[PDB]
Amino acid sequence: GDRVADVIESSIGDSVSRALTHALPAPTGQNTQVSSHRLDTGKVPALQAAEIGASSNASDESMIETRCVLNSHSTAETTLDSFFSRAGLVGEIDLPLKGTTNPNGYANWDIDITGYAQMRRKVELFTYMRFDAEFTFVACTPTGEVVPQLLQYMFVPPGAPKPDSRESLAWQTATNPSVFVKLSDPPAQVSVPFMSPASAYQWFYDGYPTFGEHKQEKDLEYGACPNNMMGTFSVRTVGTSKSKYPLVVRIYMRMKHVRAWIPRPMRNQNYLFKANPNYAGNSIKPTGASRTAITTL
C-alpha cells in the first residue's frame, strides 16, 4: 500500500502522452471568406513574433479585402502513399561473362536502397519510416536485349548462408524465399512486409551499434544500425556451366502502406556514399540559383 502523501499525489508512471494538437479532416483546400475594411486599434493580425517558434497565423481575410471562394482543390495527391508509392530504381546487379566483378555466374546484393539519389532524397525527408513494399525485377542483357535464360533470385536474411558460387548448396532454398523466372517472362514482382526488429526503419542513426572504445579503426560503424539491415539478395543463372549471355538486373521498389515521423531538412549537397551524409568540402554549393544583386532580378 501507499500512505505517504507525496506518493499518493505522484504522477510517476502515467503512460498517457498528453497531446497539444489533433488532426482534422481536410479533403480540400480551405475556402476564402468575404472580408471588409477593418480600421481597429487593439486588434493586429499582421504583427507576429517569430521568436516564439510558431508560423504566422495571419490569413488572407485579415490582410486584404477578400471575396468568397469555394475551394474544392483536392489534397489527396500529397498523402504519404501518393508521394512514395511510385516505383523507382534502388539497385543494379551485373552478371557479366569475362569481367572482373562477377565472372562466376552469381551475385550478392546487400539490401540497401541508398545508392540512388532520386529515391534516397525522397525517403530522407523523414527520420523514421514504416512500410511494406513491392519489388520488381527487370532483367536483360546490357543492350536491353531479351534472351532465353532462366534465373533464380533468393532472399538471404541475416544469419542464412550466402551463396559462394553458382553451384552453392544454399540454392536448395528449402526455407528462404526464392523466385525462378525467365528473361523472356515479364518482370518478376513480389510483396515484402515490414521486417525490422524495430517499430520503424530509420534513415539516420546518430550513434554506434555496440559498446566499447570507439577508436579510429571502428569509426566506420558510426551511424550503422542493424535494425536497417534486412539481409542479402542473391541472383544466379540456373546451371552448372557458365551462361552464354551477360546480364543486368535492375531492382525497383514501390513502397505502400506508409507511415513516417519527424521531418528533416532536405539534402542540398551531392551524395557521395551510401552509409553516410559525407559531402564534398571544397565544393559546398548554395541550395539554389544566385544573382548579382539583392535589388535586381
Partner: protein, 245 residues
C-alpha cells in the same frame, strides 16, 4: 504574462523576465513508457526528483564571428549527477527533456540565435575536400560531451543539409531585442521504447547565430550563452555494473 516565466522541477527553479512562450516539441509532453509499448520485462527504476532537475552544463561566448555549436542528448549528462550514475549502471534508458538556453545583452546590442532540436543528428565529414576520401567523424565529434562542438560549415549543418530548413524542427529564436532565452520541452523520440544512453544520442541541440552579434565600442563585449537542461520522466532498466561507454 507570456514574457515572464518560472520553471520549477526537482530542487531547481529558473526565472526569466523576457521569454517568448514555450515550445512543446511535436506537440506532445514527455510520458513514461506504457505497458503496451514496453518489451523488456524487468521493473524499471524511476528516481524522479534526484534526476529530473535542471543541470546547468556549459557556457560559450558569442562573438561577432561565432559559427554556432551543437550538443548531444543524452550524451551531455552521461557523466553528471545522479542522472549520469543511473545512465551508467543501466543498459536501458528513456526520458524527455526541458531545455533552456540563456543569453541576455542590452537594449543596444543586436543579433539572433536559432535554437533547435534535431532528432538523430548524424554528423558527416568533408570527405577529404574532394569527396574521394570516405572519412568518418571521430568519437570526440559525434559525442562531444558537455563541452559541445563548434560547427565547421553551418550552412549545411556539417551533414549536407540546409540550415535554412532547420525550422521544420522544434525551435525558438533568441533575438536580443526581444527575448533572452529559449525553452523547448522534448518528449522521448526513438523507434524503440527504451535504448542505450551511451551508444545512442536521440537528438542534438543546435544554437546557431543567423543574424551576427553586434554592438558599439564600449558596450560589454562578453556575451555568454548558457545551456541548462532537465530530464523529464526518466526511466531506467537492465541493471548491472557501471559502464562509461
Amino acid at each position: 504574462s507570456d514574457r515572464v516565466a518560472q520553471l520549477t522541477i526537482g530542487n531547481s527553479t529558473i526565472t526569466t523576465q523576457e521569454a517568448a512562450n514555450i515550445i512543446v516539441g511535436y506537440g506532445e509532453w514527455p510520458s513514461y513508457c506504457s505497458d503496451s509499448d514496453a518489451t523488456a520485462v524487468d521493473k524499471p527504476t524511476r528516481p524522479d526528483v534526484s534526476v529530473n532537475r535542471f543541470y546547468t552544463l556549459d557556457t560559450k561566448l558569442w562573438e561577432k564571428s561565432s559559427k554556432g555549436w551543437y550538443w548531444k542528448f543524452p550524451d551531455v549528462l552521461t557523466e553528471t549527477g545522479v542522472f549520469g550514475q543511473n545512465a551508467q549502471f543501466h543498459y536501458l534508458y528513456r526520458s524527455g527533456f526541458c531545455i533552456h538556453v540563456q543569453c541576455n545583452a542590452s537594449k543596444f546590442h543586436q543579433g539572433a540565435l536559432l535554437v533547435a532540436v534535431l532528432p538523430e543528428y548524424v554528423i558527416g565529414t568533408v570527405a577529404g575536400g574532394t569527396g574521394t576520401e570516405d572519412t568518418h567523424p571521430p568519437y570526440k565529434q559525434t559525442q562531444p560531451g558537455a563541452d559541445g562542438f563548434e560547427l565547421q560549415h553551418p550552412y549545411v549543418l556539417d551533414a549536407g543539409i540546409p540550415i535554412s530548413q532547420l525550422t521544420v524542427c522544434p525551435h525558438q529564436w533568441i533575438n536580443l531585442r526581444t527575448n533572452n532565452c529559449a525553452t523547448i520541452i522534448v518528449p522521448y523520440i526513438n523507434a524503440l521504447p527504451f535504448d542505450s544512453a551511451l551508444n545512442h544520442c536521440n537528438f542534438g541541440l543546435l544554437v546557431v547565430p543567423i543574424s551576427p552579434l553586434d554592438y558599439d565600442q564600449g558596450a560589454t563585449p562578453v556575451i555568454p550563452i548558457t545551456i541548462t537542461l532537465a530530464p523529464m520522466c526518466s526511466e531506467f532498466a537492465g541493471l548491472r555494473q557501471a559502464v562509461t561507454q
